[PDB]
Amino acid sequence: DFAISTSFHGIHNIVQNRSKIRRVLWLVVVLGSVSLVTWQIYIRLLNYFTWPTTTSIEVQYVEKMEFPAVTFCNLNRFQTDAVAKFGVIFFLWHIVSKVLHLQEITANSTGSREATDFAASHQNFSIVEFIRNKGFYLNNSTLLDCEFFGKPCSPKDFAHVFTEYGNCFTFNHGVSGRGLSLLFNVNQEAFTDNPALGFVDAGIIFVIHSPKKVPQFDGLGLLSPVGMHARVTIRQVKTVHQEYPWGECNPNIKLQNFSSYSTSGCLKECKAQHIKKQCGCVPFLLPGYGIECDLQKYFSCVSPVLDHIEFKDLCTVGTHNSSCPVSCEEIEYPATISYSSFPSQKALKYLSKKLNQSRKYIRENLVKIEINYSDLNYKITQQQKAVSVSELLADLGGQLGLFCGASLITIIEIIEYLFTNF
Amino acid sequence: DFAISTSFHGIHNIVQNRSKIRRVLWLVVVLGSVSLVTWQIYIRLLNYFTWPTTTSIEVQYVEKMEFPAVTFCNLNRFQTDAVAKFGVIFFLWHIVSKVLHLQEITANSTGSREATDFAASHQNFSIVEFIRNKGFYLNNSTLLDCEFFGKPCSPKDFAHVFTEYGNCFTFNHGVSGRGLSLLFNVNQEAFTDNPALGFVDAGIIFVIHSPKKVPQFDGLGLLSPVGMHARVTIRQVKTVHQEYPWGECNPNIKLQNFSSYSTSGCLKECKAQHIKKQCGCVPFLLPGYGIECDLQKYFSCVSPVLDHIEFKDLCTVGTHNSSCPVSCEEIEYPATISYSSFPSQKALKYLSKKLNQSRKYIRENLVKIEINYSDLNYKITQQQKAVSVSELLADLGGQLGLFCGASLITIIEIIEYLFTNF
Amino acid sequence: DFAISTSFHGIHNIVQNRSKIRRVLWLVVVLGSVSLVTWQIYIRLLNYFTWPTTTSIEVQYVEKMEFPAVTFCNLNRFQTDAVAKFGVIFFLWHIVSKVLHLQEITANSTGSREATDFAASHQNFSIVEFIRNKGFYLNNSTLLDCEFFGKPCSPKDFAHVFTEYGNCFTFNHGVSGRGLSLLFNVNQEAFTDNPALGFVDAGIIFVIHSPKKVPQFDGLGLLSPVGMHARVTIRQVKTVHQEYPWGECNPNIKLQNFSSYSTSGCLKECKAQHIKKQCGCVPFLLPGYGIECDLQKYFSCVSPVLDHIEFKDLCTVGTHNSSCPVSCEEIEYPATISYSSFPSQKALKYLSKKLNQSRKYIRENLVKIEINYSDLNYKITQQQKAVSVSELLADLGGQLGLFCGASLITIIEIIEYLFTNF
């Protein structure tokens, strides 16, 4: 009956051939293969739900490509004559800058006692005004030369930015073997800072970032010494992550003002929100999230909260569980650096006359940098959903067909046959 | 009739079972699944024609492996006494070297006016002869020490090459922790060049490349300063690209003399052809493509053409559309550089007596380099044709079999049945 | 008969339809597709046995991650006053240290003749005791400052290790922008070594490695000069290899004491075994493999054997054939280094008073290092068995079903039908 009609292989022999050996043997093979189908399909479905993925890598030359943004800060942060009689500022800036650098601060120290006593008295003091006026600055005396792809550029092409290093200036703000070339005058005789707080090195610190991202110096910025010429070759490396089941991304999350999401952006936004809860003001190093806090509130309100946030781990990053998951698309600019003695014996005496300064000054103040695109200047890494629902529906077809030659229509036939029997 | 014979599932129920509920319901399921097959197969075929690809990465230690070729140039390009009374050469070389470095040249400048007036008069002048004789050279006084895998090597092991930096010498021309060790004497007192043209740094510039490729310094070469010891660890990174439909490669294109194709080689060959069209001679910095041009023709014929070629973008690179597509196989040598103070207080007085020169001279002239193979010194990235025609023919079989249990024979049966009906 | 029962498509037409055109044509299509099945399946099986693989890449931020171990050595290896009257030690250490550095040694040289004459006489001499007492040491006078994630650390946190550089000390032995910060005092006035043997540079040499691996300096260690501050950013890059058929790994091999396998560990264990065969003692630079050899046996027994081992290539590495195959899991710490002038003009006079030494001493002795984790501090590369037996059994099902709609049950039916005919 159903054996002659069903397309399930084997069963037709069971009824059609009634020989004892065949009538019994054929059913055994039917049972044997049928149980094999269930195991194989089970393995297939089990593997699918693990959410496997595979990656694709592309590397190419991009003749005309968008140069990134680069921000520069002086390793000496304050004007020498603006801090000679106002040494308290180093501890005040340390406390105030605790938002960006989370390095802890030791209470009862001599420095922290002087600053606290000062803040309680000089409540008018505006740290932002002081640091803006009495810090590093881009000027004809500070940026001796600069060129972008052979076109001269001026200090007016740099946008000012605040950072734990004080005033910082970013270039290119919002071809192989070509890029940005600069020449700085660190002017150690004019800019200084406290060495007792760990600021001993002299030079320029910079970070290369996308124009849409706020630079994050921390302990991550690159360095360049005085008296050497640094050649930096950068390559753009982009990576794409799948959503939570396949990757750690989470496109649902969006930052304030619906701005493009970035892991660093979430952390800054996350911290700013908490500080605005415990205290009614936000530090000026987190610009757009509200009002600026007074000097005193840094010691009383903002400082304890930052310790609490770190202590309770309220700003986790990374996994999708984290408050700041990995971004869907990550853009990175790996760099390799080589050095040459910048002032040559011929050039040393040429610059000495041109800049009207002694040769000793030149060797100790001038920093020369050169950031270029390599030849193979592009690379994309893609995470791919190895198998989709359409892809799985093919694999299950092969196994089911291979061992039994069945089909979804065959299953319906069996169910109908069982229903009649019931 | 055909229902009892066709293997297309479902239809057998339509005719065999004539019950109103079943006779109608079964056809509905047949129609439902049949339309599902077309959508799924359409998605499969649509995805196939996108030419997807997947990559494979292999990393391994190669005990005995072919060391690449390395070429060195002095950052000071001319002998001091050969150019003291012949300062015009700096602008002459700048104009002549415009083939390699495409940096533009400002007309009406004082330097360019003197050179042009000189060229109009000294038409006998042979720039190649001058630069070859009056430039950098490898000698016992310039290459103090050199060793390759523990075997001493001599200046005779270096092959001379012309470059925008003048005379350049390449080593190894056509094991972990071992490689090439060198010690140079830049001799700033003997080699100089114009700082007003942007040559201010002193040291050695070199590039690591395959022995079959002409070095391309441009703004891509690595640097090494005087008075420091540079340790460079290299790793060979090979990548393979599929043909145009799957990748950007194009194996059909081949260079002159059927030489191995390379993106840089195509650019040089492309430029040489155009210059030979507008002008009857080729610059000597493009060696094998014809005759050498006179000094005057550089100012009159070659220089304007290069601007035109860049202006019209006649030498695009990268995509398969480009005149110089990406090579099928790319070999790259990423490098990481570390530095130490080369002359120690003990060695400084040892070299002072050995070389019979003052300690000040040693600190400002000697350059020490060391290029080594890392432990994990190899890596291959392969682009693979994810699905071939054989691979696709399995996926289409699974979907067709799964939802209808049909086969290419089943389709022929339907066509024949329709033909009889027609 | 069998045509009406077999599920192999096409054959049913052969018997059922007896029209000359159809009776013959249908069999032709049956034959045509059947031969196509064999070719397609043959291609599938042939491709499977090549053992293809595909790779997956994951990159993420790890907020709290295990910092690696770092070991430091001084580029000057011996105390100046301990070797002034005992200059033979340089050649003795060169011979003894030949186990780690395999650089050959020239017999009949003046140095090797003095050392050999000394060894034959001073057979009591214990090289291990001398180097331990009369070498580099970590001390308050040598490690001026050190901090780990903001927590001060002391010389007692470093574990002593022997190396070709003499005494070496490893930190962290068995968060983004944070790590290890150090300040060394190379004290060139106290440590020296032979420049005639190729030790001319002064500074610090270090290698970053997993805590479970013995450091391998060789020509692979990183460098840091005196008078500059080096910022090292590291990222953990882990790779996994499949077994021999798919990759070069070989999990069966295990080291002595069933310790975790590592390519470098196998080489050290391999060499130690051979030396213990030809000679009855093992060098103390291979610690755990047996007894220490006498001073004389280094010249007589150990030295010739090492040449023989290298000459006969008894310690191959890499491929699964090699005596020391690639490890199943490889952990690597790529690093990028940037530099700044360490003593600023403000800090130079601050440290001069603090350390009670002249400014010239500071510039020539102090080394500052800083090893940090980057933001994207993790990465895993996985090699995957592209197709398993379950995966293959789907592809063979699609091809067989597509062209003939057959199944493993169909094949059995044919075999039984042929048996009856036979």
Numbering used by the authors:
A (entry chain A), B (entry chain C), C (entry chain B): 40 to 213, 224 to 471
Task: Give verbatim lines from the article.
The bile acid-sensitive ion channel (BASIC) is the least understood member of the mammalian epithelial Na+ channel/degenerin (ENaC/DEG) superfamily of ion channels, which are involved in a variety of physiological processes. There is, however, a conserved architecture among other members of the ENaC/DEG superfamily. These trimeric channels resemble a chalice in which a large extracellular domain (ECD) connects to a slender transmembrane domain (TMD) via linkers at the membrane interface. In this study, we used single-particle cryo-EM to determine the structure of hBASIC in the membrane-like environment of lipid nanodiscs, confirming its global adherence to the canonical ASIC fold. By determining structures in the presence and absence of Ca2+, we identified a single Ca2+-bound, non-conducting conformation of hBASIC, as well as both conducting and non-conducting conformations of Ca2+-free BASIC, revealing unexpected Ca2+-dependent conformational changes.
To investigate the structure of hBASIC in its resting state, we performed single-particle cryo-EM analysis of hBASIC reconstituted in nanodiscs in the presence of 2 mM Ca2+o, revealing a single conformation with a global resolution of 2.89 Å. The resulting density map enabled residues 29-479 of hBASIC to be fitted, with unambiguous assignment of most side chains. Five N-linked glycan molecules per protomer were assigned at sites predicted from sequence analysis and deglycosylation assays confirmed heavy glycosylation of hBASIC. The overall architecture of hBASIC in the presence of Ca2+ adheres to the canonical ASIC fold, a conserved architecture among the ENaC/DEG superfamily of trimeric ion channels. In the Ca2+-closed structure, E440 and D444 are orientated upwards, forming two triangular antiprisms of negative electrostatic potential. In both the Ca2+-closed and EGTA-closed structures, this ‘glycine gate’ is impermeable to ions, with pore radii less than 1 Å and ~1.2 Å, respectively. The HG motif of the re-entrant loop points directly into the pore in the Ca2+-closed structure, obstructing the pathway of ions. Analysis of the Ca2+-closed hBASIC map revealed a cylindrical Ca2+ ion-like density at the apex of the channel pore, a feature that was absent in both EGTA maps. Docking a Ca2+ ion into the ion-like density in the Ca2+-closed BASIC map revealed ~4.0 Å distances between the carboxyl oxygens of residue E440 and the putative ion. Ca2+ inhibits channel activity by directly binding to the carboxyl ring at the top of the pore, stabilizing the closed conformation of the TMD, which in turn locks the β1-β2 linker in a conformation that sterically prevents reorientation of the β11-β12 linkers that underlie channel activation.
